[model samples]
Target: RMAEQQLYIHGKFVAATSGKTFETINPATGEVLATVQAAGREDVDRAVKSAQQGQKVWAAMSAMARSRILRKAVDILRERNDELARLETLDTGKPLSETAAVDIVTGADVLEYYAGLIPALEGSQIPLRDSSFVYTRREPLGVVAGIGAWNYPIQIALWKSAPALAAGNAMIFKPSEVTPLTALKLAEIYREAGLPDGVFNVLPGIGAETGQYLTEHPDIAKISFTGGVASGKKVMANSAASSLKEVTMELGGKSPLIIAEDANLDLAADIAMMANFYSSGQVCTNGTRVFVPAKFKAEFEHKILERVGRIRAGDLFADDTNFGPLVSFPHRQNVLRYIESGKSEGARLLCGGDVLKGEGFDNGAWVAPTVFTDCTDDMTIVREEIFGPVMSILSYDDEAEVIRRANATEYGLAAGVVTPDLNRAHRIIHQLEAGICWINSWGESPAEMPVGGYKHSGIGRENGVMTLQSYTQVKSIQVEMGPFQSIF
Candidate 1:
C-alpha cells in the first residue's frame, strides 16, 4: 500500500496536523489504492490564513506575470497528459480515454482560456451629464474557497480554480474526499508551472470537515462549489452563520431532452442515449428524463435502447471500453436502490439494470445501463437524480403539454430539443426553462460559455468571462472635472 497522501498548503506538501488518514479505494477493484490524509478544523484554519496572505501578493502581481504562469501551466499539463490522465482514471473509475481527452484536455483549455481573459478583464468608463466622470474597477474577492464534486474530479477543480486564479484571488480548493489523488497531482503541476507559494492551496479532506469550515470561515470572501444539490444547499445554509460569504454553485440537475415528432428519430435516439448514459449517467446535466411524441414513443424507445445496449463496458484502462464502475460501492447501492424504486413503482424495466459479476468484474462497483418506460413525472425514478446509467421515458402528445411537463420540475439546469423544423426548435428555446438549451446536439460546453441553473439546480454561473467576473467585485470612482468647485 502507498503512503498517506499529503496536503498542499502554503506551498509544499505536508501531512495533516491531525495525523489521521483514510483509505482511498479503486472502485474498479475491491482494493485499497492509497492512504490519504483526512483533515480537520486545524488544517482548514491553517489553509485559510495562508490563502489570506497569498491573495494580496498574487493580486499585486502584474497581469502579464499571472498570465505567463497560467499559460505555461497549460503547456506542461499537455506535456504530462498521459501521466495525469492515468492518475485520474485510476482514482475516479472513468475510462482512461475520457480522462485523457475530456478531463485533462478540457482542463488545459480552461486554463488557457482564463489566462487570456486576465488582460481582457478591463473595466468600463461612463460619462456623466454633470461634467464628471465615473469609471469602474474590477477586483478579486479575497481568499476564496472551492469545493469540488467527485464525478469530474480534476475537471471540476480546474474549471473552478482557473478562473479564480486568473481573476487574481488566492484560493483554497477541496476536491471530494473520494478522489483527492488527482487534485494533489494537479497542485504539484501548478507548483512546477511557477505558481507562487500559497497562491493555490489544496486540502483534500471530506466535505463534512473541510467544506463546512471553508464556507463558514470568517475571512473567506467567497465560496464556490460544484456538486449535488443536496450538499450544495448545505454550503449555502452553513455560510450564513459567520461572515455570510459570497457564493456561486453549479449544482446537479435532472435535465430533460425532448424529441418532437418532426425530429430525426435515429439521431435523437443516439444523442439522447449519450446524454443519459455518458459517464454512466454520472453527469450533473445528464438528460435523464427523456420526452417523446406519443405517436413515435415506442419506436424512439426501442432505437435508443438498442444503441445503449451496444455500449461496451469493461475496465477503465481498457482501450475499447466506454463504460466503467461507479465511484464507490455505497454509491452503487444508492443508484441500485433507485432502480428498485422504479421496479416497485410499476415502471417498466427495459434492460441492463443489474450488477455485473465475473472474473475481472465481480469485485468492482458496476451497475449496468438501466431504462424505464411508462414513467410519469411523479415517479421517484423520474423526479430524483439516479446518477447512474438510468433513463426514464415519458410520452407526450401535444407541444404545450410537453413544455408544461418539462418545466414542471424544480430543476432548470439543461434541456434539449431535436426537430427538423428550425422554427419549432427555436420556439421551444424560449419556452423551456434551462440555463442552456440544446437544439440538436447536447452538452457542448466550449471554454467560453457560461453554465448555471435557474432554480434549485444552482445559485450562480461558471464558464466564460462571466465566471471571472463572478469571482470579483466592482468599485466605481467618480471624479469632478471642475477644479475645487466649493461653494465657499
Candidate 2:
C-alpha cells in the first residue's frame, strides 16, 4: 500500500473539506507514491482565515524571537536533509545528487539568509526641511500565498516563505499536485520548530482548483506564483478580480546565451550545457537559445555533443546518474513534440531526440537531451520556451546584430555572455535585455543577489533583500510641526 498525505492547516495535518484526494506519483518509477488530500475553495477559505489569525500572533512577537524560530526551522530541515532530499528526488524525478546538493542546501541557505535579515526590517526616518517629522514603516501583509512549480518544490517553497515569515506574515503554500510530498514534509518541520499555529500551511491540489481558489480568496493579501505564461496571466486576472491582491509572478523564459569569438571553446560549451540542461532544463532561467559566432558554430556543436552525449537519464537514486526523468509522462510528451518541431523547422538535429525506453529507463518519463544547430530567428524552437533539455544554436558574426537578435524574444528571464574579454563582457551584458545576466559564467544564483525577469518573464523579483518588498506593505507617518500649525 502507498502512503497517504494530508493538508496542513493550523499547524496540524488534516483532510480536505470535501474529503477529496489526488494521486501523487513517483515520476521515476511511474507509480503512485501517495494519495494527497486535494484542497478546494472551502479549504482555501479555512487556510486563509487561519492565516489571518496566525499573522497577528506572529506579528506580536519580537523580530529577534521570530528570527530564532526561523533559524530553528532551518536547523530542523538540515538535520533531515538526506531524507527530504530523497523525497524531493522521488517526487520530481530529479537526480538525488541535485536534490541533496542544490535543492536542500540552497533552501537552507535561503531560510537562514532571511532569518539574518529579520532585524533589518526596521523603518526609516526622513529628514524634512520644516519642523515636521516623516518616517516610513515596512509592515507585513497579513496573509500571503505561494503557488510553486513542480520543479524545485522545497527550494521555491523556502524562497516564498522565508522572507514572508521573516517580515511577520502568515503564508499558505500550494505545491503542484504532481510534486507535493516534500512540501508536506516541510510543513512538519515548521510545526516542530514551534512556529505559531497556522503561520505556515501547505495545500495540495491541481492548479485550477486549489491555485485558483487561493488566488481569488478575499482574505489573501498577496500571491507569489512560479509557472508558465498562460497560467500566470490567469493568476493575474483572478487576483485582480478578487480583493486586488498584490502579485509577484515568475513565469517562463526563452532566454539567450551568447558566445563571443574570443570565448574559451571548452568553457563556453560547458556553460551552455549547464545553462540549458541543469535540472533537466526544467528551470525557468535556462539559457535555451545559444548564439555562437558563425565561424565557431560547428566547433561549439561538437563540444556540446561531447558533453551532452555522456548524460544518462535513468534511476533517480543512482549514484552515477546525473540526468534524470521529467516530472511526468505528459511533460515528456510535450518535450518530445518540441524536438519534432525543431527538426521540422529545418534546424539541424545534431544529437539525441528520442525517448529513453530500455531497462532502467522504460518505467520513467525520460527524453534524451537534444541539440539543434543552424537554427533561424523565426523557428518555433527558437521563439518558444521548450522547458526541456533542448538547446538551439543560432549563428551571428556581428555584435550589434547578435545583441538585437538576443533581445528580440518576448521572454527575458536570463541571458549569458561567455567571453574572456573584460570590456566586451560588460558591454554585451549591458545590452542584453534579461533581468539576470551572467558574464563569463552561468546559473550562479547566490542568496545575496536578486533574480527575476524582464517583460513577459516576471514581475517583481526573488531572493536577496528585494523580495521583502513583495511580502510587505509600506506606510508613511508624518507629524505636524512641533507647534500646532493650521492648514488652509
Candidate 3:
C-alpha cells in the first residue's frame, strides 16, 4: 500500500510548518500515489538555518569520517535497490527495468564514486622567495541548494549532493513536486547511514515557491539547478539579486545526432532511436534533431521505423511495457502541441504522432514514439526542445552543411556523429559545439567523465573530478619568514 510522505528537515520526517500538502501522482496510471508535505518560504528559512549548522558539524569531521559515512549510505542503497527502483518507476512513469538498471544503479554509483574521491582532495603549493612560504587549501562552499528535475529524481539528487556533501558542505535538495517519493527515500537512507541532522535535507514543493525561496535564501552559499531554460534563467537572476551565491545549472537541450553516409545504416538507426526515444525522450540531452545525409535518408527512415515499432507502451509494472507515459498530463499536452506544430509546418510524419489511447493506456498520458522527415533548421520542432519521444530528421547534402546546421541551435549539451572513418569522426566531433560528443554511440554517461554544457545548456559541470572541485573554494595561505615593511 502507498503511504503519505513528509518533508525531511534536520534529519527528521516532519510536516511543513504551514501544514499544507500536495498529491504526488503515479504518472503511469494518472493516480495519486501519496500526499507529500509542501514546503514554503518559512520552511526554506528553517532548512537553511539548519543547513548552516549542519555544515559546521559536517566540516568539523575528519575527511575519512565523512567518507566512511558516505560509503555506508552506498551500502544501504544497494540493499534497498529494488525498493527504490520500484518507487522511482511509480513516481516518474519509467519502466521498472529502466529504473532498476539506470536510475538506482547510477544513483548509488555516483555516491560511491564521490566517496572514493574525498581522501584525494588536495591543493597545490607555490614556491615563493626564500623569505616566504605559500600554499592553498580547498574548502567547502558552506550550505548549498540543489533544485532537481522530474526526469531522474533520485539520480540527479545524488549527482548534485554526492560531491556537495563529499566536499564537507551541507545541502538542501528540492525535488520536483510531482515526483518527490524517491527523494524522500534518499533522505531516509542518508539519515540511517549516519549523516548528521540537517546535513542532507529534502524539500518538496512548487518551483515558484520552494525553489524560488531557496535560490533567494542568503544562507544558501550555492544553488545547483536542473530544469528548463526559463527557470534556469530565473535561478541565475535570483542569485544575482540575493547574496550573489554561486550557481550551476544543467538546463534543457535540443541536441543533434549526425549520421554520416559511410556509417552503418542499421547501427545509426539504432543510435538515433536510443537517443530520441529512451526515457520517452524526456532526457534533457536527447538528440531530437537527427541530421541524416541525403543518400542515406530513405534507408535510415526504414531502419528507425522498424526499431520504433517494437516498443510497447503501458503501465510501469507491465512485463511487456518498455516505453512509458509522460511524467504528467500537462507535459503530455505540451509535447502533443509540438507534434501538431511539426505537421502544420509542412514536415512529413513518418511512423507515430498521436496519443496512445487504448485498453492499458486510457488513464495515462501516453504519446506514441513519433518521427518526422524533411525537417529544416528553421522549423519549430527542430528549434525547440520538445522533451518527448519526437524525432525530427533533417537531411543534409554534405558534411560541412550538416555540421553548420547541427551547431545552429543555442544548446551545447550533447551531440553525436556516427562514422567508420577515424579521421572524419574525430574531425567532426572536434568541430561540434556541444559539451559532450559521441563518435559512434549515442548515450553512455560514465561516473568518471565530466558532464556539462558549453552554451545555454548549463553553466558548470555535474559529474567527475571537476564537479567535485566545483563544490569547493580555494584559499591561499602565505607565511612571511623575514622582517615587516617600513612604509608604515
Candidate 4:
C-alpha cells in the first residue's frame, strides 16, 4: 500500500492551495523523512468553513452517538499503534519506545477517557423560588482551532482534539510545522471511526501565517495552543484583537524541582536525571532547574552528575539510546547556545557540552546531556528554558526559602517537591506558584488530572475535565414553569 502524504481537510487528503511543500527532517540522521503540504491562510479559511458546516451535524448527533463514535476512534488508534509509533519516531526523533509507550499510548488514552465524558457534558439545572424554570446548558462554540507543539506531537494533538470533539465541537488542528505527521494520521482515523467530514481537520504549516490566520479568523470561536511563551502570547493577542475568541495556552516553563533537606538523595537523583533529560529535555515542564537543600547540595549533585555521565545520546531506534537527537539542527544549536550561556554566566560545568559527531552522526542534530552546579537563580541557565539535555543545580538553605526561590521565576508551568513528610509536602505544594506540583515524583500527570502553567507559563488549562470544559460555552434556558398567567 502507498503512503498517504497530504494534509487532511474536509474529510479528505488534499494539497495546500499554493502547492507549497516542506521537508520534515529526521534529526537522528538529517534525512528527509517526508515532504508535506505547507498550509497557508487560504487553506485555513477553507478548513474553518468545512469545520463550521460539520459542527452542525456533529453537535446534532445524539450525545450517545457521538460518545460511541469517539470511543470507536480510540479502538482504531490502539490497533494502529505499531504503524504510528514508527512514523512518530521518524518525524519527532524521539525514541520508538518513548513515542509508543508515552506519546501514542497517552494519545489513545485521552480519546478513550474523553469518550466517557460526552454523556455528562450538559449544563446544570438551578433551583428557583417561583414557578420559573431555568437551567444552564453547556454548548459548543461552533469551530475551535488547536495548534500543537513538536514534542509529543501525537499526544498534544489528541489532548486538544479529544476534548474539543468530545464536547460536541468541530476542530481544526495545526501541528508544529516541524513535526506534523502523526497528527495528520489521526484525521484519517477520525474519518474511519465515523466522524463527519471536516469535523476533524489537520493543517500543517508555518505558525505565523497559518496559525495566526486561524486564531484571528472571526468564524473560529476559540483557540487552544501548546508551545513556547512568545507564540502562546501571540495566540492570545491575535485572538483577542479580532474576535475575542476564547483562548487557552499551555506554554513553556522553567520548572524547578526542590529537594528538601530530609528528602532521599537516591530518589531525588533518579527524578532529577529523568526530569531534566527525558525526551532530550525538550519537555516544557521539565524540572531543568533543580533546587537542592544547600547542606545536601553536594550529595544530590554528585548522584545527578553520575547519572548524567551514564546517559548516551544515540539514534532514535537504537535500544541503548537514553534520548535521541533534537527535532532539528537549529534547535540543537539553540541548546548549545544555552550551554555556552551557562559557562559564561559563572555556573560550574559538571559534565557533557559537546555536540556528538561520528561517522554515522555527522549530519544529525545531536547534543550530549549536560549538567551544571553552583548555580544561582539569577543565571541564564537557571532562569531561561534551555529545552535540551541541560541541568542547572541551585542550592537553598530553608524550606520556606526554597519555596520562595522556586516560585520566584516568571515561568510557573510545573514544580516538583521531594520530601518524605506528608505534612511538609502538602504545605509546600500549596505554597508553590506552579499550576501543577508533584509530591514525591516529577512529571507524572495522569490523564484524569489537569495540566497547565501559571504566570508567564500561559493562560487556561489542558487535559482532564477542566480542559473539556474550556472548549465549551454556557447558556441558560428560561421558561414558565406551568404556563402561568401574567404577574397581574
Candidate 5:
C-alpha cells in the first residue's frame, strides 16, 4: 500500500511553504513507509492565524451547533474506521486487532462523548446571600495547541482535539514526529465532515522546531501535551517564554503493578503481561515496575514469565503478533541500554535480555520482553521511566512497605494493586500517591474516567468531565435580582 501523506491547514490539504519533506520509517523492517511535508515556522504562523480567526466564529456558534458538527465528525470516523485502524497500526506498530478494537473505537467514543457534553458545558446558577443572583459560565479558550505522543498518536490527538472543538475552541495539532500519519489522516476527516475552514489544522514536524514554535506562539491560548518528562519540561519552558498559556501535560511514568497474596495468579499474570508489554511497552502508563509480597514472589514471577514468554512479536500486519518493534532505532537502543544497565547492576535477568533474533525479525528495532529481579528502590532500573518492554520486580514484606516503595519515585502517574480483599484495595487506593489507582488490573482506562498524574507526572487531568475545563475558562456573571447587595 502507498503511504498516505498530507498536511491539513486551514481545513485543507496544503504543502509546506518551503516544500520540505521528511520520511517515516517502518521500525519493524527499517523501510521508508512515507515521505511527508516538514512543517516550518511559516506553516505554524499560518495555522495559528487561521485558528485565531476560526475561534471567533466557532465561539459564536451555539453549543448545540458545535455538538452536531462533532457528531458528524464521529460518523465520518465510523465510516472510515477500518482505514484509520490500518494506518494507526502501521504507523505506530500497534497490533492491528488492538488498533481496531481499542484505539479507533475508543477514539470515536471520545468524540461522541464530547458531543453529548456540549450542552452540559454551559454554566450553572449559584445561590448567593441577599437579593443577588450569581452564575458562572464556561467559555472556550480561544485557540488550543495539541502536542500528541507517538505511542497512540491518533487516539491521543483525538483526546486533545475533540473536546477542544466540542467546547468551541479552534485547534492546531502537532503530532509526534515518529507517528504523525494517522493524526494527519484524522485531520482530513474533520474537514470532510463540514467543519469550517481554519477550524482544525495539522502540522507534522520535529519537536524541537515545529512543536516548540507552536507552543511558544502567543496566539495559542492553551496547550495540551502528552509525552515524556523531558519534552514536557521543554514545552512548559517554551510556553512560559511568551505567554502564561494554560497547559495540561500527561507525561512520564515509572508506574508499578502490585500482586497481592490473595489475588488470582492466572488473571494477575495475564494483566501484568498486558500492562507491561502491550504496544511494545511504549504506553505512558505502562507498568515498568512490580511489587509483590515476599511469600508469593517466586510463584508470581514464575507465572508472569510463563505468560510473557508466550507473547508473539512480529510484523505489524501479522495476525498472530501481539507486539511490534520500537518506534525507531534510537528507541530500541535506549531500551537495550536499560536492560544492559540492569545486568551490570547485578540484577537477575529472568527472561529476554537481548535483541530479538531467530525469526523473520532479525534486522529491525525489536527487543524481546525483558524482566529483572533483585532490584532495589534506588536502582536506575527501578526509578527511571524506561519506555519499553523492560520491567523490574521488587519484593515487599507488608502492605505499608509496598505502598512506600511504590510511592518513592518522583512520578505519580498510575499504579495497580491486585487483591480480592476489598479493604486492601481501598487501603492502597487511599495511601498510594499516584493520581489513578487500579485494583486487580493494570493500565485500564475508560473514556468517562479522569486520567492524569500527581507531582511531575503531569498537571491537571484528561478524560472525564474534568477535561472539559482544560479546554475552557470560567467567568462569573452576576445580576442584581432586586437591588445592590452590601458586602459582609
Candidate 6:
C-alpha cells in the first residue's frame, strides 16, 4: 500500500497535529484508495491566521501584479491538464473523458476568465447633488473560506477560489474528505504558478471538525460553501453565532423541467437526461423533477424511457461510460430508501427502480437510472431533492398549472422549459422563480453569465464579471470641490 498524503496549509504539506488520518474509498470498487491526514480545530485556526496575513499583503498589491500571478496560474494549469484530469477521475469516479474535456478545461477557463477581469474590477460613480464628489471603491474582504463538494471537487474549488483570489483576498479551501486528492494537486499547481505562501490553503477533514472550525473562525471574513442543504444550514448557523461573517451558499436543488405539449419531444428528452443524470444526478442544479402537460404524458414518458435505458454504465476511466457509482455507501442507501419511499407512496415505476446487480458491479454503490410516472407534487419522490439518477415525472394541465407546481417546491435554484413557441418560452422564463431559467435548453452555463439561486437553493451568486462583487466590500470616497464654512 502507498503511503498516505498530507494536507496543504500555509503553502506546505504537513501532517495533522492530532496524528489522525482517514481513509478514502473508491466508489467504483469499494476499495480504500488513499489515507489522508484529518485536520483538527487547531489546524483550522492556523490556516485562518495564515490567510489573514496573506490577505494583508495580497490586498495591498496592484491589480496588474495580481493579474500577472493569476495568469501564471492559468498557464500552469493548462500545462498540467493531463495529470490533473487523471487525478480527478481517480478520486471522484467521474468519466476520464469528462474530467479532461469538461471539468479541468472549465476550471482553466474560469482561472483565465478571472485573470482578465482582475484589472477591470471597478466600482461605479454615483451622481449626487452635493458639492462633494462621491465614488465607490471596491475592496477585497479579508480572508475567505471555500467549502467544496465531492462530485466536482477541483472545478467548484476553482469556481469559488478564482474570484476570491482575483479580488485580492486569500483563501482557506476545504474539499470534501471523500475526494481531496484533486484539490491538493490543484494547490500544488497554484504554488508552481507563483502564488505566495499562505495565499491558498487546503484542509481535508470531516464536516463536524475542521469544516465547522473553518466556518466559525473569527478571522475568516467570508465563507463560501457548495454542498447539501443540511450542511449549508449548519454553516449559516455557525457563521451567525461566531463572527457573523458574510456567507454565500450554493445548496441542494430539486429543480424542475417543464415541457409543454407543443415542445419538441426528441430534443426535450435528450436535454432532460443531460440535466438529470449527467453526473449520476449528483449535480446541485440537476433537474430531478419533470413537469409535462397531462395530454401528452404518454409520449413524453415513452421518449424519456427510451433514452434513459440506453445510458451506458461502466468504469470511470472508460471513454464511453455515461454513468458511474455514487460517491459513498451511505449515499447509495439514502437514494435506495427514497426509491422505496416512492414505491410505498404509490408512484408508478416506469423504468429502472432498483439497484443493479451484475458482474464487477455488486461491490460498488451503483444504481440504475430510474424514472417514476404519475407522481404528485406532494409526494416525497417529487418534493425531495434526491441527488441520484432518479427522475420524477408529474403531469400539468397548462402553463399556469406548470408554473404553480414548479414554484411549489422550496428550492428555486434552476428551472428549464422546452418549447418551440417563442412567446410561451419568454413568458415561462419570466414567470419561473428560479435564479437561472433556461428556454429550450438545459444544463448549459458559460463563464460570462451569473449562476446562483433564488430561495432555499442558495444565497448570492458566482461567475461572470460581477462575481468579484461578492468577495468585495465597497467604500465611498468623497472630495470637496471648494472650501465652505463647516458647521460642527
Structural similarity to truth (TM-score) of each candidate: 0.97, 0.98, 0.98, 0.96, 0.95, 0.96
lDDT of 5 by residue, 117-229 (tens): 98887688987767777998788888889999989888898888888898889999999889888888888788777677788899998897889888889888989899989
lDDT to native, each model: 0.87, 0.90, 0.91, 0.87, 0.84, 0.86
Give the lDDT of residue 419 in candidate 6. Answer: 89
In terms of TM-score, which candidate is strongest? 3
Q: Candidate 2: which stretches are off by over 4 Å?
A: 481-488
Best-matching candidate per lDDT: 3
TM-score for candidate 6, please give it: 0.96
Clashing pairs in 2: none
State the lDDT at 253 in candidate 2: 92
RMSD of 6: 1.7
Q: lDDT tens string, model 6, 1-488? A: 33697878777898888678888877778777789888898888888788887777788888888888888888888888877887777777777767788887888788889988888888878656566778998888888999999998999989999999999899999999889888888788777777777889999988988889988888898999999999999999999999989989898888899998898889888878888888888888888889888888899889998998789888778788878888887998999999999999999999887787888788778888999999998899898988998999998897888888899878999999998998888988798889887888887678888899989999989899888777888998877676768698
Where model 1 places Cα greater than 4 Å from the true spot, the runs are 129-131, 481-488
RMSD of candidates 1 onward, in order: 1.6, 1.3, 1.1, 2.0, 2.2, 1.7
Minimal lDDT window, size 10, model 1: 479-488
TM-score of 1: 0.97
Candidate 6 off by > 4 Å: 126-131, 481-488
Model 1: pairs clashing at backbone N, Cα or C within 3 Å: none
For model 1, residues 211-318, the per-residue Cα lDDT tens digits are 888888898899898988889888998887778889898987889999988888999998888798778789988899999888998898889778877988886887
Model 3, C-alpha of 191: deviation from truth (Å): 1.1
lDDT of 2 at 197: 90
Which window of ten consecutive residues has the lowest lDDT sum in model 5? 1-10
RMSD of 5: 2.2
lDDT (C-alpha) at residue 203 in model 3: 96
Model 4 Cα RMSD, 1 decimal: 2.0
